[PDB]
């Protein structure tokens, strides 16, 4: 599954519901600690919707357990994003993914 | 042809073109997406900054190439100059 | 000699191969760029002439041969122990020459590239010997710049043996540059080597030299130094707090950094030891700096995550409390009051130790040292000062 | 006080000081020595608050000094510091500062800041260092923590041979001390370790066998040290890339460790975990039953388990007592310290005991199933020195310090951001600035090849692979640049 372990506290209240769209800003880190992604490196937000098969779902659970104005840290093992493939040229075959994640808006 | 009353010419490329042109494309290069749609296209950048940013240092190495300094960017005239009008060369290619 | 004929009986022309091959280097040199257009181009025709008559009489299958034959013996030693002292110490250098003879042959000539694309796959088996790597990469890359056949030859195992040369062999600029002839030649890319090229080297970040951003970091500390020595007049506990005034999270694309703690200077000198002047690094990062940032233990560069109530990093309106005991080495923190659930323990107690706050753009925090120093908000344990 | 100024070619080194060799020539007042292999008579003495004027003119190779405007002179008349030289490579501003003294070098940015100038240096024509310059100029400076680099070839007191593992015989890398014996040799415990680390596991665990071997992580490197060498100087075992610590005299007692205890919230110590940087034991202690080193060398073996992380010691066919436990993604670098007293002092060798991998396969991806021991070219002996320099960065942060009250204590306060762009080697685990690769020389060459790989691999509408190099070059990054 996916652990997730909070950094700032949210509202804890307004969670994301069915088909609601989240707009989040990530940055991806490597087990070992290198960083292969961040949207606040492009600075625009990520819109990304709940249960439509957007994002990997270690993404996705870890923002639907996650909840509004809530900056955690999010955990992928390689089954849940990426698998054995993995992303060419990004992520090496078999990789965890460690993401720095935060709800700014429900919209 | 001309932009008044008298036969003066007007400033390279300002004006109004209606020729067809080839339509910009780009996508957002994020990695958490599994969408293989954003592999087309060439990735975004901030063509505005970078705009800005070329316009001011161009504005710079006019300054400090007269000057005729012992310290130019890169060590050389040639690392100062040509890697920035190449830019410039290319935006203004692209039309921004 | 293979057939185990006796050595003496073998005769081996070795010192006669040697000068041929030195003036047939020297026959097939390139036009120097210092001469007159006229003269240079003169020699250029002459050199293609004499590559085609090369070519065409098959001189180029020959040396093949003879680095093949050379090749069999491992080592200069071993090639000794057959042949002689003379052929073992002659062995590395006719190999080369035959080498730079063979580069010097194809170099410039696109028919005679193309016809070694039978043998490309040949050359390629032998990369990984010390003894002809360098030669057979500058065959390997004239063969490349000119013949768009030796392109589509060139397969997958190919191009990982050619990127293992890199992680065997060590950082080398001309087996980058025959990767970058591999993408492109004569203005023609080819999809499936820079695919090829992309997914077997990119991803590792093990062999390529790695880029990133990291926000400037600087430490700040109090003129007090701490120590602990027999027979010295010291208090062996202490205590210090740190108010965070304003943080701002994200002041660029990086998170900002706010640590505290002790950290302890290297021997008896003044300067903080075991870490660098200036950089990126801070409280924590090496094993002279004890640090918290209210997530995790920072020490030696590593961090492990401490369990408090309601955790969560640096925020305005938050008071440190940072304990020091000398009498057991022991560092433990109290965030607002609520005491941290992890200390360190049993470290080095030879140097000096005094409080440190390390930071990136965009903090404001207080230190109270107590007295007419900025008055406690909570009160220090019992029996520290 | 003991401090020279002068002009150094870009071949100096930090280590030695100014004058003794050919690369610099400059000017101690406090002795009134004149400083260039070797030192003669020249000039006064300074006192607190003078000022020196260094005057070269490359032209037909001449120099001097003024002091508060006069010019030094030597012994004779003549004003010439130094009669005659080559121009060489070049010459740059260059001074040394002795303990607890204090300078300030004013390469003439701007001619109003030079006070002696006017009177001295301005009539001649001679100019200020950086008069035609817009930027400052970049200060190096002698690095104060030693880094471990390849042992040289003309080092004079360390040779390193490469022994190619024959059919009976692993590969093996020898230390040799050349000048040892021989007067002016200097004997101290001399820091040596291998290029590549090995790296445990991200997660801890919860006729040879074929199967054994291909599912194993143990690996194995054993250390020879030669008769007549001292056991009791030569110390084996891994360190860390965080080891930079340089001492006359080393002791197993006096390496850096911490121990971490998180605790429950009762206060039960849950977990206790030992951090260090040196994981090493020493052959004297290692070697109980004594004499069984000088009919054969000392053997002392390393195992490492990438697996659990479990650091255990094999000496003479006898496991040893002493073991380390380490925590998960460590990059442990074979390492040895030793003490030479003999021409010989030991010697790495990259075998395999039974059930274990040999060392190259945990450091080399592509033979990590290879039960053969190799030493490719890349894995070299290196050693702990203190000749290198560093960097000043040009600009620094903006911190403001001030007491408020007696109440409120003491403000620091930082606003403005800054960054810097930072190469980080992997092999070494190490990062530097990248600004630093404009005397990093080889560095900057594969990086700018680099640099062509990855406009090659995305050249010609390669969108794919665009989007893939935009993790590895990012927008920041390229607006830095």
């Not at chain 3, 694309?117 to 065959?139: F, K």
């Not at chain 4, 000048?179 to 991200?202: H, K, V, W």
């Not at chain 4, 190490?430 to 560095?443: K, P």
């Amino acid at each position: 599954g996916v652990e997730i372990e909070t950094i700032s506290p949210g509202d804890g209240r307004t969670f994301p519901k069915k088909g609601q769209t989240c707009v989040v800003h990530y940055t991806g880190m490597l087990q070992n600690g290198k960083k292969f992604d961040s949207s606040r490196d492009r600075n625009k937000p990520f819109k990304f919707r709940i249960g439509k098969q957007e994002v990997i779902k270690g993404f996705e659970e870890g923002a639907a357990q996650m909840s509004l104005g809530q900056r955690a840290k999010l955990t992928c093992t390689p089954d849940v994003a990426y698998g054995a493939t993995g992303h060419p040229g990004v992520i090496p075959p078999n990789a965890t993914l460690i993401f720095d994640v935060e709800l700014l808006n429900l919209e | 042809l001309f932009p008044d009353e008298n036969k003066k010419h007007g400033l390279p490329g300002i004006g109004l073109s209606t020729s067809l042109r080839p339509r910009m494309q780009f996508s957002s290069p994020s990695f958490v997406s599994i969408s293989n749609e954003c592999y087309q296209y060439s990735p975004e950048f901030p063509l505005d900054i970078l705009k800005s940013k070329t316009i001011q240092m161009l504005t710079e190495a006019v300054k400090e190439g007269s000057l005729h300094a012992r310290d130019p960017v890169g060590g050389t005239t040639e690392f100062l100059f040509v890697p920035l009008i190449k830019l410039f060369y290319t935006l203004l290619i692209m039309g921004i | 000699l293979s057939k185990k004929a006796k050595a003496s009986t073998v005769d081996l022309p070795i010192e006669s191969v040697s000068l041929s091959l030195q003036d047939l280097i020297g026959y097939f040199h390139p036009p120097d760029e210092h001469l007159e257009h006229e003269d240079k181009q003169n020699r250029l025709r002459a050199l293609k002439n004499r590559q085609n008559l090369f070519q065409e009489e098959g001189m180029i299958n020959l040396v093949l041969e003879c680095i093949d034959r050379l090749h069999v013996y491992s080592s200069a030693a071993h090639f000794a122990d057959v042949a002689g002292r003379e052929a073992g110490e002659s062995w590395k250098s006719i190999l080369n020459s035959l080498y730079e003879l063979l580069a010097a042959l194809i170099r410039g000539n696109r028919k005679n590239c193309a016809q070694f694309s039978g043998s490309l796959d040949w050359l390629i088996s032998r990369l990984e010997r010390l003894e002809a790597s360098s030669g057979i990469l500058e065959v390997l890359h004239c063969v490349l710049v000119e013949s768009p056949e030796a392109l589509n030859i060139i397969k997958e195992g190919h191009i990982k043996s050619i990127i293992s040369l890199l992680d065997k062999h060590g950082r080398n600029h001309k087996v980058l540059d025959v990767l970058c002839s591999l993408c492109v030649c004569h203005g023609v890319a080819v999809r499936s080597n820079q695919h090829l090229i992309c997914d077997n080297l990119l991803p590792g970040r093990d062999l390529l030299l790695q880029t990133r951003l990291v926000n400037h970091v600087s430490s700040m500390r109090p003129n007090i130094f701490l120590g602990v020595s027999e027979g010295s007049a010291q208090y062996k506990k202490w205590y210090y707090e740190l108010m965070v005034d304003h943080t701002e999270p994200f002041v660029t694309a990086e998170a900002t950094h706010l640590r505290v703690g002790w950290a302890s200077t290297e021997g008896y000198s003044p300067y903080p030891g075991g870490g660098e002047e200036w950089g990126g690094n801070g409280v924590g990062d090496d094993l002279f700096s004890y640090g918290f940032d209210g997530l995790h233990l920072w020490s030696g560069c590593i961090a492990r995550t401490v369990s408090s109530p309601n955790q969560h990093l640096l925020r305005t309106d938050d008071v440190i409390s940072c304990c020091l005991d000398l009498s057991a080495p022991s560092i433990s923190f109290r965030i607002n009051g609520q005491p941290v659930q992890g200390m360190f323990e049993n470290f080095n107690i030879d140097g000096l130790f005094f409080p440190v706050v390390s930071f990136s753009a965009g903090i404001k925090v207080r230190f109270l040292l107590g007295g007419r120093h900025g008055e406690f908000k909570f009160l220090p344990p019992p029996g520290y000062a | 006080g003991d401090m020279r100024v002068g002009w150094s070619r870009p071949g100096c080194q930090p280590d030695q000081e100014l004058g003794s060799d050919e690369r610099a020539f400059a000017f101690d007042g406090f002795k009134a020595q004149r400083w260039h292999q070797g030192n003669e008579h020249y000039g006064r003495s300074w006192q607190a608050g003078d000022v020196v004027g260094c005057m070269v003119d490359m032209n037909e190779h001449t120099m001097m000094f003024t002091l508060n405007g006069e010019i030094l002179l030597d012994d004779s008349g003549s004003e010439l510091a130094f009669k005659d030289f080559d121009v060489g490579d070049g010459f740059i501003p260059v001074c040394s500062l002795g303990v607890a003294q204090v300078g300030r070098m004013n390469f003439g940015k701007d001619v109003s800041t030079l006070k002696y100038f006017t009177i001295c240096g301005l009539q001649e024509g001679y100019e200020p260092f950086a008069v035609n310059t817009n930027r400052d100029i970049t200060m190096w400076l002698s690095k104060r923590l030693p880094q471990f680099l390849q042992v040289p070839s003309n080092h004079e007191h360390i040779e390193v041979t490469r022994i190619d593992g024959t059919i009976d015989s692993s590969p093996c890398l020898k230390v040799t001390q050349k000048s040892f014996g021989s007067q002016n040799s200097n004997t101290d415990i001399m820091f040596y370790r291998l290029s590549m680390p090995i790296e445990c596991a991200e997660v801890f665990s919860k006729r040879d066998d074929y199967d054994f071997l291909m599912q194993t992580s143990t690996y194995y490197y054993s250390v020879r040290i030669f008769p007549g060498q001292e056991p009791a100087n030569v110390w084996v075992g891994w360190i860390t890339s965080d080891f930079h610590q340089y001492d006359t005299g080393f002791d197993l007692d006096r390496v850096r460790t911490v121990t971490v205890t998180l605790g429950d919230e009762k206060g039960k110590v849950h977990e206790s975990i030992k951090r260090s940087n040196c994981y090493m034991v020493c052959a004297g202690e290692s070697m109980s039953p004594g004499q069984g080193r000088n009919n054969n060398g000392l053997e002392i073996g390393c195992v490492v388990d990438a697996a659990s992380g479990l650091l255990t010691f094999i000496a003479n066919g006898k496991e040893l007592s002493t073991y380390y436990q380490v925590e998960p993604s460590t990059k442990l670098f074979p390492a040895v310290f030793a003490q030479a007293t003999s021409p010989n002092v030991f010697q790495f060798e990259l075998g395999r005991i039974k059930n274990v991998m040999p060392l190259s396969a945990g450091l080399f991806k592509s033979e990590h199933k290879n039960p053969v021991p190799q030493c490719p070219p890349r894995l070299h002996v290196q050693f702990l020195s203190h000749v290198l320099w560093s960097r000043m960065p040009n600009q620094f942060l903006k911190v403001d310090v001030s007491r408020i009250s007696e109440r409120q204590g003491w403000l620091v306060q930082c606003l403005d951001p800054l960054q810097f762009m930072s190469l980080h080697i992997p092999e070494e685990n190490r990062s530097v600035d990248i600004l630093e690769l404009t005397e990093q020389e080889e560095l900057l060459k594969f990086h700018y090849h680099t640099l062509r790989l990855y406009s090659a691999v995305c050249a010609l509408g390669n969108h794919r692979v665009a989007h893939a190099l935009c993790s590895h070059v990012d927008e920041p990054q390229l607006l830095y640049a």
